[PDB]
């Protein structure tokens, strides 16, 4: 049990400062890091061709929204392509993001792959050459990263293997990021697919998060220089029992309180399949939950920040301003929610 410090005091300070800036009071993260394949699905749903120019234009649309988003957006997550694209005025997109007060983030995973011998479970690849990629990304303006693991609640899932293997790969990814001055966002996503109830989600979330933080400990991860991107605890999409937002909040915050060490700087929730308003209301309820919550509780939203903007845009340039207006409004809503100031205007049961 001997210490061979992974990081010097100077490196730790850098990572903690980055993580805190990202989730500073009022702020959250725009997840605009959809891969070519995944954003294709997005463009297809508004009858728009999947071209590099259309992708650049749409990302530009979000990133150059007016300065009302500035106090709302602490970080933006980009896909590799977008990190090296430019606004119309010649400015690299990372420069655009920084000029508006946002930290630049990069998605570094290479997608999920099947775990043999399991019931449709996966782990995530992307470790190969990751240190070199992170050194390069750091040099080109990124200060944090994202890696997404995916788990499913079902009859025999998540299995012990899936839990252990996904926690392990997350820790390796985190270790490599921190060696290169990159703050890792750890995403152990538990899908909402299925008809399980709220407490089954809460139980699995608690088990998954316990495994994640044990792996991070084993791999010597500096928690203060990390963020967590979990699912909210919710019933399954097909569950018949209804729950209030207060119950979703309580279950979510209880699960986190039981597993997430206080040294973690912030929890940036994924929105999953939730509508824009639903995601905002839940995040707001979570921040109003009367329990002690010793980490920032904010958003890292893809769909829940973009759904309307993508719609209003319809792939037509003249709609640019109305689409940006849709984004800014969700940005404002979620900035309020991550402070518990959003208005549409028995713990032991957990």
């Amino acid at each position: 049990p001997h210490s061979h410090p992974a990081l010097t005091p100077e490196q730790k300070k850098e990572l903690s400062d980055i993580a805190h800036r990202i989730v500073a009071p009022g702020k959250g993260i725009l997840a605009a890091d959809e891969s070519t394949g995944s954003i294709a699905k997005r463009l297809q749903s508004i009858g728009t061709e999947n071209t590099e120019e259309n992708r650049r234009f749409y990302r530009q649309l979000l990133l150059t929204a007016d300065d009302r988003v500035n106090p709302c957006i602490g970080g933006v997550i980009l896909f590799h392509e977008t990190l090296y694209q430019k606004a119309d005025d010649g400015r690299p997109f990372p420069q655009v993001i920084k000029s508006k007060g946002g930290v630049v983030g990069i998605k570094v995973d290479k997608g999920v792959v099947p775990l043999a011998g399991t019931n449709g479970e996966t782990t995530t690849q992307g470790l190969d050459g990751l240190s070199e990629r992170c050194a390069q990304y750091k040099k080109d303006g990124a200060d944090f990263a994202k890696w997404r693991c995916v788990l499913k609640i079902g009859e025999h899932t998540p299995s012990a293997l899936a839990i252990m293997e996904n926690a392990n790969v997350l820790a390796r990814y985190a270790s490599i990021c921190q060696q290169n001055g990159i703050v890792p966002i750890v995403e152990p996503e538990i899908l909402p697919d299925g008809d399980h109830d709220l407490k089954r989600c809460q139980y699995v979330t608690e088990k998954v998060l316990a495994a994640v933080y044990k792996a991070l400990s084993d791999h010597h991860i500096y928690l203060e220089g990390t963020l967590l991107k979990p699912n909210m605890v919710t019933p399954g999409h097909a569950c018949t029992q209804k729950y209030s937002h207060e119950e979703i909040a309580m279950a979510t915050v209880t699960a986190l309180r039981r597993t997430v060490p206080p040294a973690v700087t912030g929890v940036t929730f994924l929105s999953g399949g939730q509508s824009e308003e639903e995601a905002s209301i839940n995040l707001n309820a979570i921040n109003k939950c009367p329990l002690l919550k010793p980490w920032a509780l904010t958003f890292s939203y893809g769909r829940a920040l973009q759904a309307s903007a993508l719609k209003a845009w319809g792939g037509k340039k003249e709609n640019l301003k109305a689409a940006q207006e849709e984004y800014v409004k969700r940005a404002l809503a979620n900035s309020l929610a991550c402070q518990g100031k959003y208005t549409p205007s028995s713990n032991h049961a957990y």
Copy 2:
């Protein structure tokens, strides 16, 4: 994995209420749970015979001190024998304690045993018939329990085996306690023995508590109905490098923040080989640390509540008052300490 609830909401509420009572603001725990062989050592240091009557009398002395300890003392841990002894007025000791505002605790472990294949490391025994014992203890007035694992920082210790095994047995004990409405105090003590510096203790303490909480999770422990009893993070006893109390506090609070889930109701530090004054100054510094601390940080002191009481007693019936006075002074000192009201680059941690 599928849920098969260990506890009902009503069982959870009971355990949570107990844990919060013990560590309510300004309160800590008196650890008077020395076994026969251990208390023998105490009495020996004051030239006093180790008879049941002297044990009964010494405990009486501590437990019936005046009402100025009432707000200082949320809990009192007893050894089996004492739980069934009575004060001079005929009242069972559990009743004395309860009448003064205290929750009754019972140590239930049966001591350390060697782990073979290790360099002098141990685990702790005491699981056998534990459930039946707990049911009886509960019936006879106890609401919490204590179990002590011991780890040591050395050349090749604590080993992975020692960490894994002590964490696992602590989880088994916590689980059984909770099934019987007893709040388990989880004590994974890392000894201060040796010449290691402060950061090595911080490193080992962080690794140990990560293991403890993973094990508590695997065993479905309800954290809200548990307390943690760790060593403070300090340099080894023979460490040549010196540190301030503020550094001790920072290393300690940082270790806990990196491992102890917010759901844990309280952390009740053991005093180790710290003097009465040192133990209070450090607990005060810890509570003054500038970080967020989402659990009570208070005391479960044995020696550091008793050193001066014992010496002033000296084994003489007629020194009762002066001895009870020394105990009350340490109780008052530590009550202020766990509130940060006692006067006698964190990225580097």
Copy 3:
């Protein structure tokens, strides 16, 4: 990872020597180690009262059967009470067993306890004071021990927790036994309860045994000085599908080949509710299975050695010889079975 040898070369030689004697070619184990409440059930099944004297007599009946059993029986497992009883002629039962060429064994667990938050799963207790017990048992003539863990195949079982905790307590027991010159028989019994098929049993058996052997390594267990007592791999009791003895044998030996290091001296199957004949026929098929089998494959039978003897006895002293005759025939049959001499597409596994 540094070695701090658990055992000297001399301690190893002793343990290995004992292990090999117990499972010498043709030899198996009589499990007569039913606890008071377990033998009670057995006695009620023949309307016989559970008194110490009837237990003594029944155990005497088995232990003093004629010398035809000597080449058959390498070891006899006893419950504590029986280790300290005497035959009619005054000879301690251990002396009896040993004059007939057998090694004396002692069951040292204290039964299963419930694991909270599981679907009816258990672990096993009995570690407290185990070292002191083993040294006394060794002094009083025992050279090996037995410890039973119990796992169940069901919807959510055996869980990760059940598998990890039972592997772990098995390793602790093994470590303590070996410190005291006692060969531990490691028994992780997977019950045949339920309607699961043969491949499900095989799968759960492989997962359980992998966990067991990893735990034994973590705790520095000297495998040459151990024996394994697993279930055979068979369909569940309620399973509607039919299998031949050859498929049971193939599944069992395949399971063992994938998990049990060659260093293990022997595998002594529990009978697990199989009839006497079925248990013998399966062991026989296991020993004829054409795959490489680098450990002795033999028996540690309770019911499959006793059922007919207990029936022929029916609690009447005068049925002594008819009773013993039934036991001797099962001893003979099983000694032949563990030699593959008893007569009353591996990639599919």
Copy 4:
């Protein structure tokens, strides 16, 4: 837990048949899978330039030695480049290997990388797109693969982290291979660097192998369709105490017996820094060791099959035959060793 078979009976049969073929009696493996950067250091030691043609030529030299090697060589491991190279007669190197009765193997790892927070310890990278790479390698003639993890004996190493992480990634790699009809050789190398003694190496080897097989079990690996490639148990290179070959063999076979399940089809030892003769004598002692050994015990040698052949070649075209003769000699020596029938540059330490 519930079963969702990773493999069908048909797939198991194929993987089992491949594994048994590689380590059939008398047969071992030639490890010719040095990456560009490693073969370069090989060529440097003989003033030969590191060019594609020199590498191609040297590999041809080994693969086309006369037919005396056919019964000695059950498998040949190649680096990616070599897999798609051809001999002078236009035949792809895999065709050459098969025509001489050998199975074709492909190294698929992408080298070691540092584990942060450790004392100089590594894990191994190479899982990204491994499935796709394996499917392609299968199509192009390869039936097994090799992946190398590296561990080091020292004061604080191997650490719990290094052991777990390396065993886990080995399991991931084994799993992906088997999904694509490729037999994975699992190589958990414990370096002989340092001055530790025999029993320390034996202890570390037992611990590392227990972890590797637990990982493989957790990841549902089919052991009959794997091979293991461990270090032999030996004292450290700087250890002053001396041991006989019988002792090395005993410690090696004991360590294996305590950790490697009988289902594993074979154990193909790495030579490490052992001389060509040292590697053959030890391998021979191991097979003569009077304990029960339920797996084939053979070789997967790089340096210990190639040292003399490299030196005799010297990069000169005209030394073709002289080189091949040195290789054939080591191959025959080792085919006998892995049967326990072997009796004695081939003496120079290759550390």
